[PDB]
Each structure stands twice: as structure tokens, then as C-alpha cells.
Amino acid sequence: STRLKIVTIHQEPFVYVKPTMSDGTCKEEFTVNGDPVKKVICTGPNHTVPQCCYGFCIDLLIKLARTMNFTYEVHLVADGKFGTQERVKEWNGMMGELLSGQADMIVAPLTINNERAQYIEFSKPFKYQGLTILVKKGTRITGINDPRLRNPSDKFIYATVKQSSVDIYFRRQVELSTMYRHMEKHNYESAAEAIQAVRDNKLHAFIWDSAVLEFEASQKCDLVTTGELFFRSGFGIGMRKDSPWKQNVSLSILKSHENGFMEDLDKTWVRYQEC
Amino acid sequence: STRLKIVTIHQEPFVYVKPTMSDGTCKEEFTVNGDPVKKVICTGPNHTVPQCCYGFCIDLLIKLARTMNFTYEVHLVADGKFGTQERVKEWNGMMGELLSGQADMIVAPLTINNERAQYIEFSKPFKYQGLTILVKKGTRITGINDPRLRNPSDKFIYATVKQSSVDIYFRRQVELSTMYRHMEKHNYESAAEAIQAVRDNKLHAFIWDSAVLEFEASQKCDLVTTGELFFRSGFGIGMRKDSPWKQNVSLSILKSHENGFMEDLDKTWVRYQEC
């Protein structure tokens, strides 16, 4: 009947965003084994214009749309954010768009957490992840229990992104009190700057989402992730409560974990051999 | 109004099962730091009798019951099984008990998968896991892509449990065809026997649930798990579809991942230092 409004956000390798060619089409590209890269037009801010979206999440959308037989239009979130609750409390970003009806589904690396789940519903997770630690190659940190994290000094500086979900996690547990006070002093304004600081040896360890950090390490051989994951979670498709789509989207995702499909998406988008 | 009927199954460290003392009570025990071990009476086959249940899942039940203010009675599944669909197709084990009304909730290390999710609903996961590989200490296997798994010979024998979810997973993907044919020749009748065979160097690698194998390695220093997890999944509380309990059980579980509670259960039940 009517096309679902899909909202997404720019985050490689889940969603790449590139300009259209001069004729308005998306450049034809192929995988190493000759398969066409599937691309969709996604409108959004560069001024709102049609752009080209592809990646793990786009391939997943396409699989869901074809399996469940729905049609869709994809756009990039207008304010460029995942969504937090803020005073004007109302959700902004993709959460706000989903709740307002500007979107019908959020298809993106959207972490399942208590706060969001109070307002929306999630599919079963299409990818598992957690927090991990990004360091310079050669640096050894066992995880959140490493003595250089538990007993901080300026000889080994670690941090996360100010006001992020990570910042909030450390703030909330008394046993991490000592780590939180160190981080509160070194936290960065954005993940990109924290990542650069590790490359530049101004930050010894950056604590962040594993799906982000592992992707950085796969592309930049002077960086690596280290240690046991902690605060595990999953990424799910977001829908308003009592969605007609949730059950079948969840069943498709579970089937895909079990039949190789999700693994094929990981081989296609997440796995590299440069480093 | 009425007590929820909780069904569970014996699997350390999630559910320990021990006899009552001579007077019918459960032995008072304490953690290393002095805290009482919480125990519940769980009736079930040793002839159905009251026994003592405690562990990660029992602590979780207790937290849910107190948070949501419900009361409950726990029993061990009558046929001793998680549940498969079989001809008489009807579910047996905990699935069958849940569907028949003999249980209202399954509180156990119950893997979320497509087949079960067709019939029941799950809470958000209280523990993440996957498949991993159990080997003798000193043996090195990178994961499911290790050359000694991909290119099998009788110099390095690996196997799983016949007719298990693992057996079925390998059967279903063409790219694992060669591994499946090796395993089909060495598979064991039960996880206990496969585990013993690794200890006895009759089986070089056993492919199984990480929550099981990691627990074995934590208790038996001649065994270790090795390699990257694969076929990740989660354990969830099982309820009949459209349960009044699901939303609040899921919200509690998500909060517990975020506030230290789940981590405390891992420190209490899963973490050891002998090995």
C-alpha cells in the first residue's frame, strides 16, 4: 500500500553515504568476487539531497523488504543524531523521527538499551557488540580490569566521549569511581578526535563501541583493539510499539544468524586483511 | 493472586541442584565475602521431590520477583530436557511445559533461536554467548576458520554432540560441508562424554556452547577454550506469547546490564581464579 519510511545514519561499514554521479545515479561498484554492490538512494543533508547509501544495514534492509514483501524509502536523519532526551523532555534524532512518524523504522547500528526500550520496540539483534578499548599497536591492556585502568596515572591516559552512553555507564557504578574521575578529566568532544589522539599518542586508550573501534583497527594498521569486551549489547531495528513488522523482522534476523546470511554480511562488510 | 510456575533445568553455574538436608531445609552457605547464598526449593525428579536450587538464574529470578512484585514456585523440568519438536509434532521439555501451562516462565540458560521464537516469546537476553571450542591446555585453534578445522584429518579430531543445535548448524551451510562430514564421523552422544574425551586426548576439540565450555575450563585446569566465538546468540527468559510479564522482565534485564547487577552475578557465579 504505502512505502515504509526508513531512517538511517551515516556510520561505516553499516551505512556508507556518497554523492550521486552527475546524472543522479549511484556509481556501479562490485565486490572482489564480482557481485554488484547494492545501493539505495537516501535523501538527507549533505540542504536535503538524494545521496547513495550502501553497507551492512542497507543489505539487511533489502533482505527484509524482499522477504516480507514491503516497499520503502530511506532517508538520513535530519539532525544527524541517534537520539537523546532533551528539554525543549522529547527525543531527538532517529528516536524522535520514529516516535513522530517521520520514520516507520530505524535501520542503523542502534543499540538496544533500557532507556530507548521504554519508548520504542526493537527487533532481535542483527549484530552483537560491546565496549572495547582502542590503543596504539604494541600496547597491551587486558580489559576494564587492567591495573593501568584501575589505578590511573598520567603515564597512561584513557578516556571516552563526553556525555556519551559510555561516560554515563562509568558514572553509574561506585566500583568504577576511580576510573570515572580520571576519564572525567580527559574525555573528548567526539569519537573522531579521540581516535586521532590515539594515533598521535596524546591518548593512550579510547573506550568505545566495538563495532566502531574494530572497524578503525581494520583500516588503520597503527591502531588495534585490545582486551575482553564489556558492557555487551546488541544492535536492533527500531519500531514504534505494537508495530505490525516486528515479529517477522525478528524471525528473519534470527533465521539469518542461523543460515549463514548474517555471516555473509560480516564477510562482505566487516572483515579485512590489510592489517 | 496466584504463584507463577517457574520451570528450570540443572546446569551449573546457572542452576545448581542439591538435595535438602535431613530436616528438609537447604544448607546455609555463604560467599567468600560473607553474603548468604540465596536458595529456593525446586521440586523435580531426583520420583519427584523437593530439592535445593541456586545459581545465576535463581538470583535473577529473585531479583525479577522482588522488582515486579510477583510470587512463584520453581520446579525442574519433568523430562529433563530443554525441548525439541518431536512426533508423538509437539514440543517436549521446557518448551512443551511452557506451551501446555505446566509452566508460566522458563528461567534457565535457554537460547534464543528462530524455531523457539516461532512458538514462544523471549525476554531481552540476560547473558550473551556463542559457540566456542574446548581443547587441551597448550592446544591452539583460532576459531571456526582454523586450517586444522577447515582441512580435517585424523591427526586432529573435532566433534560436537549428535543431533544437537550445533550439529544442525554445520549441516545447514554448504561452506562448512567439509567440516560437517568430519564431525558426522566423530560426534558424541552427550556433551559430558565429549568433554571427558578431550581430557583423555581421544578428542582434540569439542565444539559447544561457550557458557558451558568456559565453565568447564574455569574448573578443570587441563582444559581451555580457544578461538573467536561464532554463531553468537543470547539466553532469554521464555514466556507464552502476549505474556503480561515480558515488557517488565525485559526492562529489568536491560537495566541490570547497565547498572552493574548482571556483572555482579557474573562475579558471583562465573568468575574463578584456580586456572
Å between B181 CA and nearest CA of chain A: 18
Alpha-carbon torsion (A125, A130, A135, A138), positive or negative: negative
Do B168 and B53 have their domain in common? no
Å between B170 CA and nearest CA of chain A: 9
Yes or no, beta carbons of B113 and A258 under 8 Å apart? yes
Question: How long a stretch of residues is chain A?
Answer: 275
**Number of domains forming the structure of chain B:** 2
Separation between Cα atoms, residue B181 and residue B178, nearest integer Å: 5
* Burial status of residue A250 (CB atoms within 10 A of its CB: 0-12, 13-18, 19 or more): buried
**Phi, psi values for residue A171, rounded to 5°:** -65, -25
Do B113 and B29 have their domain in common? yes
**Read out DSSP for B183-230?**
HHHH-BS-HHHHHHHHHTTS-SEEEEEHHHHHHHHHH-TTEEEEEEEE
Alpha-carbon torsion (B236, B238, B239, B240), positive or negative: positive
H helix intervals, chain B: 56-68, 93-100, 114-117, 147-150, 165-171, 177-186, 191-199, 210-219, 246-259, 261-269
Q: Which residues of B are annotated as a binding site for glycine?
A: 109, 111, 116, 165, 209
> Which residues of A lie inside 8 Å of B (Cβ-Cβ)?
112-114, 117-118, 124-125, 128, 169, 172-173, 175, 231-234, 250-251, 254-255, 257-260
The answer to whether the beta carbons of residues B82 and B94 sit under 8 Å apart is yes
Strand partners, A86: A90
**CB-closest option in A112, A125, A258 to B169:** A258
The answer to whether the beta carbons of residues B105 and B239 sit under 8 Å apart is yes
Å between A26 CA and nearest CA of chain B: 32
Do A67 and A121 have their domain in common? yes
**Read out DSSP for A63-92?**
HHHHHHT--EEEEE-TTS----EE---EE-
Q: How far apart are the first and last CA of chain A?
A: 47
Q: SS in 3 state form for A160-222?
A: CECCCHHHHHHHCCHHHHHHHHHHHHHCECCHHHHHHHHHCCCCCEEEEEHHHHHHHHHHCCC
Mutate to test the interface with A, among B67, B111, B114 (most CBs of A within 10 A): B114
Separation between Cα atoms, residue A51 and residue A76, nearest integer Å: 9
For residue B76, give the H/E element and its range.
strand B72-76
Exposure b/e, B132-154, CB count within 10 A at least 16 = b = bbbbbeebebeebebebbeebee
Residues of B in contact with A114 (CB under 8 A): 251, 254-255, 257-258
Give the single-character DSSP code of B25: P
Do A198 and A221 have their domain in common? yes
Do B113 and B41 have their domain in common? yes
Separation between Cα atoms, residue A3 and residue B237, nearest integer Å: 35
Domain that holds residue A17: 1-128+237-275
Separation between Cα atoms, residue B237 and residue B125, nearest integer Å: 7
Separation between Cα atoms, residue A130 and residue A211, nearest integer Å: 8
The answer to whether the beta carbons of residues A8 and A76 sit under 8 Å apart is yes
Do B216 and B81 have their domain in common? no
Pairing, β A127-136 against β B105-106: unpaired
The answer to whether the beta carbons of residues B80 and B94 sit under 8 Å apart is no
Residues of B in contact with A173 (CB under 8 A): 259-260
Exposure b/e, A77-97, CB count within 10 A at least 16 = b = bbeebbbbeeeeeebbbbbbb
Report how far apart, in Å, the C-alpha atoms of A232 and of each of A229, B142, B216 are: 7, 22, 22
Residues of A in contact with B258 (CB under 8 A): 113-114, 169, 172, 231
* Inter-axis angle of helices A246-259 and A56-68, nearest 10: 120
The answer to whether the beta carbons of residues B51 and B57 sit under 8 Å apart is no
Å between A79 CA and nearest CA of chain B: 27
Separation between Cα atoms, residue B9 and residue B109, nearest integer Å: 8
Separation between Cα atoms, residue A155 and residue B240, nearest integer Å: 54
Strand partners, A135: A224
Shortest CA distance from B229: residue in chain A: A128
Give the single-character DSSP code of B134: E
Shortest CA distance from A166: residue in chain B: B258
Whose grid coordinates read 512458538?
A: B119
**CB-closest option in B118, B232, B259 to A172:** B259
Mutate to test the interface with B, among A111, A114, A144 (most CBs of B within 10 A): A114
For residue B5, give the H/E element and its range.
strand B4-8
Separation between Cα atoms, residue A203 and residue A160, nearest integer Å: 10
Whose grid coordinates read 578428542?
A: B203
Whose grid coordinates read 545521496?
A: A51
Which of these, A109, A111, A116, lies nearest to A10 by C-alpha position? A109
Which of these, B233, B196, B256, lies nearest to B68 by C-alpha position? B256
Pairing, β B238-239 against β B205-209: unpaired
Amino acid at A28: E
- B88: CATH: 3.40.190.10
Strand partners, B238: B106, B122
The answer to whether the beta carbons of residues A5 and A106 sit under 8 Å apart is no
Do A69 and A160 have their domain in common? no
C-alpha cell at A40: 539505495
Å between B168 CA and nearest CA of chain A: 10
* Burial status of residue A21 (CB atoms within 10 A of its CB: 0-12, 13-18, 19 or more): exposed
Give the single-character DSSP code of B260: S
Residues of B in contact with A128 (CB under 8 A): 128, 232, 234
For A149-155, the CB contacts below 8 A with 24+ separation are: A149/A179, A149/A205, A150/A178, A150/A179, A151/A178, A152/A178, A152/A179, A152/A182
Q: Which residues of A are annotated as a binding site for glycine?
A: 109, 111, 116, 165, 209
Separation between Cα atoms, residue B124 and residue B246, nearest integer Å: 9
| Coil vs helix vs strand at B239 | strand
Yes or no, beta carbons of B172 and A258 under 8 Å apart? yes
Exposure b/e, B239-271, CB count within 10 A at least 16 = b = bbeebebbeebbbbbbbbbbebbbbebeebbbe
Å between B111 CA and nearest CA of chain A: 11
Do B68 and B176 have their domain in common? no
Which of these, B219, B206, B202, lies nearest to B167 by C-alpha position? B206
Report how far apart, in Å, the C-alpha atoms of B140 and of each of A15, A24, B253 are: 36, 52, 36
Separation between Cα atoms, residue B163 and residue A19, nearest integer Å: 50
Residues of B in contact with A257 (CB under 8 A): 114, 231-233
Shortest CA distance from A248: residue in chain B: B118
In angstroms, this model's resolution equals 1.9
| Coil vs helix vs strand at A139 | coil
Give the single-character DSSP code of A30: B
Q: Which residues of B are annotated as a binding site?
A: 109, 111, 116, 165, 209
Separation between Cα atoms, residue B4 and residue B246, nearest integer Å: 13
Do A9 and A35 have their domain in common? yes
Pairing, β B40-45 against β B48-54: antiparallel
C-alpha cell at B136: 587441551
Do B122 and B207 have their domain in common? no
Do B188 and B112 have their domain in common? no
Size of interface A-B (CB pairs under 8 A): 58
Separation between Cα atoms, residue B148 and residue B133, nearest integer Å: 13
Yes or no, beta carbons of B258 and A172 under 8 Å apart? yes
Question: How long a stretch of residues is chain B?
Answer: 275
Separation between Cα atoms, residue A144 and residue A248, nearest integer Å: 37
Chain centroid to Cα B270, Å, comes to: 12
Do A57 and A93 have their domain in common? yes
